[PDB]
Design a protein around this ligand. Structure first.
Ligand SMILES: *[C@@H]1O[C@H](CO)[C@@H](O)[C@H](O)[C@H]1NC(C)=O
Ligand SMILES: *[C@@H]1O[C@H](CO)[C@@H](O)[C@H](O)[C@H]1NC(C)=O
Ligand SMILES: *[C@@H]1O[C@H](CO)[C@@H](O)[C@H](O)[C@H]1NC(C)=O
Length: 146
């Protein structure tokens, strides 16, 4: 099989905060926050799915590398047709997160949790408790957090 060179550096802040440092020691990092706070609402122009979630990083610099990193991150979940979380792109120029991933479904939450547990290791299971659950994806600056 083929080995991608665009593998980020994972680092876990805590049970709900995670970072994927852009490959080749980039000056940026993908920020993943597990939270039940809804920040984004469905709009006629911002709906996305796992197949074109890269379009939530259009106006960003080095958008190619961001797309490659998100591609690495979503391996094994996008190919799944039974993994259909609502994904809402956000206006980064207005201060919104790059993407909001609806993981309210027990199965979607379970899949995201298992992928992130393969990446970062053991942490608190967010799907035990019911209710709304989201993964907010943004791009933050690397300040040598780890
Ligand atoms: C997890 O880390 C973030 C980032 O520093 C912080 O805002 C948040 O309060 C932390 N959560 C807990 C439960 O400590
Ligand atoms: C992703 O593709 C769907 C159709 O498959 C489309 O409706 C949606 O607008 C696309 N996402 C973006 C951000 O353009
Ligand atoms: C997330 O999904 C649930 C059910 O799948 C839905 O009730 C909720 O409205 C969705 N979130 C948003 C912001 O639309």
């Amino acid at each position: 099989s083929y080995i991608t060179p665009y593998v980020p550096m994972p680092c876990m802040i805590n049970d709900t905060h995670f970072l994927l440092r852009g490959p080749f020691e980039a000056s940026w990092a993908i920020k993943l926050e597990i939270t039940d706070v809804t920040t984004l609402v469905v709009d006629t122009d911002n709906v996305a799915n796992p197949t074109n979630i890269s379009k939530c990083f259009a106006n960003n610099q080095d958008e190619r590398l961001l797309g490659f990193t998100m591609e690495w991150f979503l391996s094994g979940l996008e190919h799944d047709h039974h993994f259909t979380p609502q994904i809402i792109c956000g206006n980064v120029s207005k201060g919104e997160v790059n993407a909001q991933v609806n993981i309210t479904m027990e199965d979607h939450c379970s899949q995201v949790f298992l992928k992130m547990r393969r990446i970062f290791g053991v942490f608190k299971n967010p799907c035990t408790s019911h209710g709304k659950q989201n993964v907010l994806i943004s791009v933050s600056n690397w300040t040598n957090q780890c």
